[PDB]
Amino acid sequence: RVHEVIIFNELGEICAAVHQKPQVSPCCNTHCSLRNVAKIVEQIDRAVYSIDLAIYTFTSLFLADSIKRALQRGVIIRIISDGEMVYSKGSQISMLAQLGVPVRVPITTNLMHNAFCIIDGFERVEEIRLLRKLKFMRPCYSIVISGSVNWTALGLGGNWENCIITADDKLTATFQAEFQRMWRAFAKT
Amino acid sequence: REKASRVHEVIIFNELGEICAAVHMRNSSMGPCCNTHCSLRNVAKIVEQIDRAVYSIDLAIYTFTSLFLADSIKRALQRGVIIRIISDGEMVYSKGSQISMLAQLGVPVRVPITTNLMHNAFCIIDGFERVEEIRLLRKLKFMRPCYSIVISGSVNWTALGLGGNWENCIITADDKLTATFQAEFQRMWRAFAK
Ligand SMILES: [Zn+2]
Numbered sequence: 462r463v464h465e466v467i468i469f470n471e472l473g474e475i476c477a478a479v480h481q482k483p484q485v486s487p488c489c490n491t492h493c494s495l496r497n498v499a500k501i502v503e504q505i506d507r508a509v510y511s512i513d514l515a516i517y518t519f520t521s522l523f524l525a526d527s528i529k530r531a532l533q534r535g536v537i538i539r540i541i542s543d544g545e546m547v548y549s550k551g552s553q554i555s556m557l558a559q560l561g562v563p564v565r566v567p568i569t570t571n572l573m574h575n576a577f578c579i580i581d582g583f584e585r586v587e588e589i590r591l592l593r594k595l596k597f598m599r600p601c602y603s604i605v606i607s608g609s610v611n612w613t614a615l616g617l618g619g620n621w622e623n624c625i626i627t628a629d630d631k632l633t634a635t636f637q638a639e640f641q642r643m644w645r646a647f648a649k650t
Numbered sequence: 651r652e653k654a655s656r657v658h659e660v661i662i663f664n665e666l667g668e669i670c671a672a673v674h675m676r677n678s679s680m681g682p683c684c685n686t687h688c689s690l691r692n693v694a695k696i697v698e699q700i701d702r703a704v705y706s707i708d709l710a711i712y713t714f715t716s717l718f719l720a721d722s723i724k725r726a727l728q729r730g731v732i733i734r735i736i737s738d739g740e741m742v743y744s745k746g747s748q749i750s751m752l753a754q755l756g757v758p759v760r761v762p763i764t765t766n767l768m769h770n771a772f773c774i775i776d777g778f779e780r781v782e783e784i785r786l787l788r789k790l791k792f793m794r795p796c797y798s799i800v801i802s803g804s805v806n807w808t809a810l811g812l813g814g815n816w817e818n819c820i821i822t823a824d825d826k827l828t829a830t831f832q833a834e835f836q837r838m839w840r841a842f843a844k
């Protein structure tokens with residue numbers, strides 16, 4: 462399965478001249494930011510039951526659109542955000558909250574820098590199944606995308622960022638558990 | 651089996667990190683805690699990896715404020731470990747930043763030229779490529795036993811929970827991940843400025 466480090470750096474745009482968005486034409490730049498973006502979005506496009514998103518700042522249009530498409534397929538999406546940033550200027554979260562996506566934020570003022578996203582997490586999918594009242598689910602498996610606090614900027618700004626995309630059962634288990642924990646303990650908006 | 655026994659977990663700092671502070675103080679006065687989110691246990695797991703380093707620690711870091719972390723980097727240095735820092739061009743000067751102190755002890759520090767954000771927060775311990783480079787550079791025919799460990803996560807996992815913010819880092823000896831992080835360190839280090 463997938464187990465990969467996505468790395469944004471200063472070389473991400475050196476191939477700009479050769480360039481359901483994004484549609485990335487082939488290039489020879491191993492550091493292509495567009496390729497990085499397309500890989501992340503792909504994982505979202507592959508969600509079938511659930512997306513749990515703990516995020517610090519959500520300004521990316523490419524990401525918001527993929528979250529939008531997921532909803533239309535009937536993927537159950539929940540967002541956890543930093544309290545200060547949640548409805549700051551540029552935030553896509555309001556838009557998503559308009560479509561029915563629930564959003565929770567911490568009570569405490571501290572920085573919520575845990576930017577990760579669990580797709581079809583095992584514990585979460587089983588949770589849906591029971592509440593959805595089912596026995597058989599369509600086939601899927603857990604993916605976590607996690608890393609630097611602005612990986613969800615999706616290359617926006619040309620910074621040095623990173624996220625790991627992995628199907629590792631232990632890591633995906635831990636992230637999903639913490640989201641469940643934060644979801645129960647945080648406040649709605 | 652013994653390799654699969656090696657460190658591979660995610661460490662999470664959250665608001666429950668200091669819930670056990672009184673339990674700890676009662677024990678210290680002479681009278682181990684049950685908190686799964688214990689922030690002290692978190693930092694001990696992190697610092698355990700630093701103390702393990704045999705040859706190299708390559709640190710790509712956004713902000714380095716922790717005294718407790720700078721201390722462990724000091725022990726490694728006195729153990730002979732070769733430490734290198736890549737930092738954010740602006741945060742290197744900020745309040746509480748330990749970069750100057752470490753640099754004065756002879757740690758080489760590099761920053762990017764631009765004012766863009768260096769939001770990488772990773773640490774490679776004895777990355778295979780870097781140990782080989784060190785072996786080749788000192789004309790050695792062998793090295794002591796060791797293995798790659800990388801710590802990587804949210805922008806300020808290096809504050810070590812100080813501040814009680816939500817932070818996280820993967821700590822793993824996973825071969826692919828360590829090699830990938832070490833390679834980006836080598837690239838940046840070559841590309842960057844003193
Ligand atoms: Zn390209």
Ligand SMILES: [Zn+2]
Pocket residue numbers: 670671674683684685688689690691
């Ligand atoms: Zn404790």
